[PDB]
Structure 1
Amino acid sequence: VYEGKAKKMIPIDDDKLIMEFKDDATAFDGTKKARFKGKGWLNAQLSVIFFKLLEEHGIKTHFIGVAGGNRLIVEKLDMYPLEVVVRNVVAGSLKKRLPLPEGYELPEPIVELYYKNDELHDPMINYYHAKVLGISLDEIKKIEEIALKVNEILKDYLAKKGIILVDFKLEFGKDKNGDIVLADEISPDTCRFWDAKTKRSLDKDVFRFDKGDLIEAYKEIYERITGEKPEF
């Protein structure tokens, strides 16, 4: 059993594991910490909806099934040590890299690669760093191609629900066939979602910058997407 900041990973056999979503939330390299009753449930359910949508569009994900509420069954993968960030609208750390205001609409998507490494606080890397880390150029290109395809599908789907997909973080791993498979989660923890009309955050930024009620914000996302009220 691996216990992370947001989730628990419980081995089943050699082929699969249980991904359990906790109520814990962290920010700022994990220096800001809180708990939000029902957060795990919402993130689990939204991950499921997103993975299923993406699977219908021919994206290979680790999603296998549900294991009752806060737990997903997922394929075990040899993980790439990357966080792959896709950005449509300027926000967060991008403001420190390009002299563009928050809300600036990008002419095309930006993909950023981050090296998952706590010693180094997850630095941004490029393709040459990735190669030194054992990730070939073809693997990187395949990964960015998938991320960009995921972007189009999620942003289209969300725009039709009055939600702007500002940016989001993905993780990937390799399966036993050597195929690149989308992993981890897709939730208001790992994406920026803005209301189309008011431009307000319906995501982890509410917690990051004390913008109000996180659970309310995560509920509103769930309701706008499912059309139903959360049961917890």
Structure 2
Amino acid sequence: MRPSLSDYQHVASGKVRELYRVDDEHLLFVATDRISAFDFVLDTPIPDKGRILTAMSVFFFGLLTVPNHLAGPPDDPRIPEEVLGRALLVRRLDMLPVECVARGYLTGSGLLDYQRTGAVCGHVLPQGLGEASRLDPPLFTPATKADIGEHDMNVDFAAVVGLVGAVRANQLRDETIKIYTRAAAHALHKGIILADTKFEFGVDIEGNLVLADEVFTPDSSRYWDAAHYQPGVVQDSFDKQFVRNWLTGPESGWDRASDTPPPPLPDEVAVATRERYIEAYERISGLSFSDWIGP
């Protein structure tokens, strides 16, 4: 018999993910069906989003050869029925206070930093780059969490050294670029560009570096349709563009310029978005989401 979620201690709330203590050495990492757009957690959940993103993370953990925090199978008996398929039993780590970001393409705050300074996170780049320009080699563009509402702050390699040590910073940089490169090539082979990605790592009892959190989800990574990749313009979000377009379209009644919370989504937009998540998962993994476990 699976335990109730109420049997575990809630330790951390993200906007979209939850974390619970299972015992002294294990956590329960829970994805919800909540979706964020324009830095708002929207009223309307995307059905099965938590399950699909959990399935995606599990796929990529298996694709990569590096140590990760998974501590049991997706149907581990310690996982409550209520969160089955969207929760993982993981090893408790000492988390390193660095957002480990790799960028294979120049967009978002990376592009903005470049347009302001000619550099991103200490990397002085060629002149003449622009929106969605390919970056070769991919860049390690680390960041640190800021206050509750604020975006992460981009920092350079020296900042990472000061946070975790010189040898460890080297290790973070190398592993971040290595696993990003591997996953990005895999996805592109299936017609999806992983434009960038954000990792969190922790350290286990033996001092080993361990990949944690979620990996290569469309929340942790910019997913693009490769078939429509066009450097020089903003690429559509593979998963979130229907949501973005509706929210900023004539039917929402919402003004994004106002920092007022957005209205709920049409059911059909939520269902369409769910479909996009399933398509991305199935294309990348070569698996069927209908086989993924659930309540």
Interval of TM-score (by shorter of Structure 1 and Structure 2): 0.7 to 0.9
For residues 76 and 205 of structure 1, what CA distance do their matches in structure 2 show? 35
2:102 match: 86
- Pick from 32, 40, 45 the counterpart of residue 31 of structure 1: 40
State TM-score, norm by structure 2: 0.70
1:136 shift after superposition: 0.8
Secondary structure of the 2:277 match is helix
1:207 shift after superposition: 4.4
Question: Residue 205 and residue 144 in structure 1: after superposition, are their counterparts in 2 closer, same or farther (change >3 A)?
Answer: farther
Comparing 180-189 with 152-161, greater Cα deviation is found at 152-161
The question of 1:188 aligning with 2:218 is answered yes
- Pick from 7, 11, 16 the counterpart of residue 17 of structure 2: 7
Letter in 1 for 2:171: K
1:222 match: 281
CA contact (8 A) 2:70 2:89 kept: yes
1:39 shift after superposition: 0.8
Q: How does 1:111-122 map to 2 (within 5 A)?
A: 111-118=140-147, 121-122=151-152
State TM-score, norm by structure 1: 0.88
Comparing 105-114 with 218-227, greater Cα deviation is found at 218-227
Question: Residue 206 and residue 183 in structure 1: after superposition, are their counterparts in 2 closer, same or farther (change >3 A)?
Answer: farther
The question of 1:172 aligning with 2:208 is answered no
Letter in 2 for 1:31: F
Q: Which has the higher contact order (CA 8 A, sep 6+)?
A: 2
Question: Residue 132 and residue 140 in structure 1: after superposition, are their counterparts in 2 closer, same or farther (change >3 A)?
Answer: closer
- Pick from 141, 159, 166 the counterpart of residue 170 of structure 2: 141
Question: Residue 170 and residue 22 in structure 1: after superposition, are their counterparts in 2 closer, same or farther (change >3 A)?
Answer: same
- Pick from 132, 149, 159 the counterpart of residue 103 of structure 1: 132
CA contact (8 A) 1:164 1:195 kept: yes
Secondary structure of the 1:96 match is helix
The question of 1:51 aligning with 2:61 is answered yes
1:16 shift after superposition: 1.2
Secondary structure of the 1:12 match is strand
Identity over aligned pairs, percent = 33
Letter in 2 for 1:113: P
Question: Residue 46 and residue 93 in structure 1: after superposition, are their counterparts in 2 closer, same or farther (change >3 A)?
Answer: same
- Pick from 184, 188, 208 the counterpart of residue 155 of structure 1: 184
1:43 shift after superposition: 0.7
The question of 1:41 aligning with 2:71 is answered no
CA contact (8 A) 2:138 2:181 kept: no
| Equivalent pairs, count | 227
Gaps of 5+ in 2: 1-9, 116-128, 230-235, 248-268
Secondary structure of the 2:289 match is coil
For residues 173 and 208 of structure 1, what CA distance do their matches in structure 2 show? 33
From the two aligned structures, give the one with the greater strand fraction: 1
1:11 shift after superposition: 1.1
CA contact (8 A) 2:161 2:168 kept: no
1:3-33: CA deviation from partner (whole Å, max 9, x where unpaired): 22111111111111111110112244x4353
Letter in 2 for 1:224: R
Question: Residue 98 and residue 20 in structure 1: after superposition, are their counterparts in 2 closer, same or farther (change >3 A)?
Answer: same
1:60 match: 67
Letter in 2 for 1:201: S
1:51 shift after superposition: 0.7
For residues 173 and 242 of structure 2, what CA distance do their matches in structure 1 show? 28
For residues 181 and 6 of structure 1, what CA distance do their matches in structure 2 show? 22
2:122 match: none
